[PDB]
Design a protein around this ligand. Structure first.
Ligand SMILES: CNC(=O)c1cnn2ccc(C#N)cc12
Length: 293
């Protein structure tokens, strides 16, 4: 079986052993495209951790599972979720990671209206993460609100590296059709070889999420939305009239069709819009446990 074969491959790269030995009270708190996320209690300490559980038989491209252990081993950073250990548990890859108790940005953009101080704080944090990743040739390829997690005290971290890839002198561009339709860069939908620029486009779409509450063409079925992204001019905010000229100027550097003219993360870190960025505390009131209080 290719399955048994693949299990054996994964064992070669993961930690030995079984975290069920030291964790209690697995409770499911969400699901991505590649698996589920449980919170667990470390028995000895009462500390909470997050465990991502990805079934080897339920992946579109099961070789992408290796990306989790590449990021874990190599590209840890303060705006990236800490990954502690990886294990093969039966037919699943388990990744034990930091619990980001503030939850995902998705809940906030769904239920709340972020102001520009808050939007700037998120964008700055993501851009710091991306400048460091991109400098190392790492492309995330699934930037969207669901991929952004928050600490209780409002610090922002990138998560969901399942679809990441590496470029280098010897492999300067990627070609794979990877991401989430509504957030995919037009050059990527067009099947042009691409680089880290695609992440900057996806971030632009996330800015639209944060302003409009959904990405462009979210009402269209995905295959149809990709067609639209590929063919049309850059998407426009439903609520253009609600954003500062500073934010519009910023967004216009992100949603550039031509990847060669799109701003890089490192350039975007100096943009005046990010001077508006609030401290982590500024994000805390948006979280489900605070907004009702
Ligand atoms: C809604 N909350 C979460 O899903 C969550 C919380 N901490 N956390 C850490 C890593 C991953 C991944 N991958 C997800 C999460």
């Amino acid at each position: 079986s290719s399955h048994e074969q693949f299990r054996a491959a994964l064992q070669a790269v993961v930690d030995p052993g079984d975290p069920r030995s030291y964790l209690d009270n697995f409770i499911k708190i969400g699901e991505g495209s590649t698996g589920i996320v449980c919170i667990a209690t470390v028995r000895s300490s009462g500390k909470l951790v997050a465990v991502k559980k990805m079934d080897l038989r339920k992946q579109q491209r099961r070789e992408l599972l290796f990306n989790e252990v590449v990021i874990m081993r190599d590209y840890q950073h303060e705006n990236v979720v800490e990954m502690y250990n990886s294990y093969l548990v039966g037919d699943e890859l388990w990744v034990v990671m930091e619990f980001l108790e503030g939850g995902a940005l998705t809940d906030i953009v769904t239920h709340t209206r972020m102001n520009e101080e808050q939007i700037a704080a998120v964008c700055l944090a993501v851009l710091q993460a991306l400048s460091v990743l991109h400098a190392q040739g790492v492309i995330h390829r699934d930037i969207k609100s669901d991929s952004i997690l928050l600490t209780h005290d409002g610090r922002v971290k990138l998560s969901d590296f399942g679809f990441c890839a590496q470029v280098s002198k010897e492999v300067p561009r990627r070609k794979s059709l990877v991401g989430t339709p509504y957030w995919m860069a037009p050059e990527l939908i067009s099947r042009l070889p691409y680089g880290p620029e695609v992440d900057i486009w996806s971030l632009g779409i996330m800015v639209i999420e944060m302003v409009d509450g959904e990405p462009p063409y979210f009402n269209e079925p995905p295959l149809k939305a990709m067609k639209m992204i590929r063919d049309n001019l850059p998407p426009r905010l439903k609520n253009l009239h609600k954003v500062s000229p500073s934010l519009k100027g910023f967004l216009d550097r992100l949603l550039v069709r031509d990847p060669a003219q799109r701003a890089t993360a490192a350039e975007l870190l100096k943009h005046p819009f990010l001077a508006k960025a609030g401290p982590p505390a500024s994000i805390v009131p948006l979280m489900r446990q605070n907004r009702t209080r």
